[PDB]
Design a binder for these strands. Sequence first.
DNA 1: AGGTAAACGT
DNA 2: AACGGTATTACCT
Length: 202
Amino acid sequence: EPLAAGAVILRRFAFNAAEQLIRDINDVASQSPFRQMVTPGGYTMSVAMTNCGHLGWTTHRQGYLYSPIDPQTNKPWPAMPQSFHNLCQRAATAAGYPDFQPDACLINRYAPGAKLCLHQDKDEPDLRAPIVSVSLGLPAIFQFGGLKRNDPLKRLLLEHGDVVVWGGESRLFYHGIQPLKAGFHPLTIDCRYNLTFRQAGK
DNA sequence: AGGTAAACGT
DNA sequence: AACGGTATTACCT
Ligand SMILES: [Fe+3]
């Protein structure tokens, strides 16, 4: 059974690419550090985030925003690594989205206990483009629902190297990550990373 | 009009 | 601990 209409999980797709991806995560973070963002309502998110590519997702007092500039550094987000772009393109193609051209990559870091409550990826003006989501390090339970918050959730363990792609009918589906279980991974040690690729501009 | 933030009790 | 209330409003454009 496929994940959902327009959605697929490519298990261990990024396994072979993972070591390089993690080197590049470190490189990106060395320029735009991971930060736990504060919601408009004033709560600090448990996931630490950064971005690369032309547009980075951030919170603001007034809401969520894509910006070409990191509000923390006041500099552009780091360029999207070629390893990221190449893996994203290969995954998108395998998943049936050959023409996807991301301009934004959000990098998420989960420590034990860190979670991401159900939400929609909805800040992008062009909903034709899919989301490509790469998991690295410790395993996590991914919730994938529907268009409405109360729609039944599927729970999928995402393991190191797994890639999930959603788009088309499932583009705006609610999704999230359950509190990360403590553990060890030879490549990330004690955390999970996730790369989320999007086309956030025109 | 419409968009839209949302991360505690049972 | 899985599920669902809350935004059933209060603003901005
Ligand atoms: Fe998301």
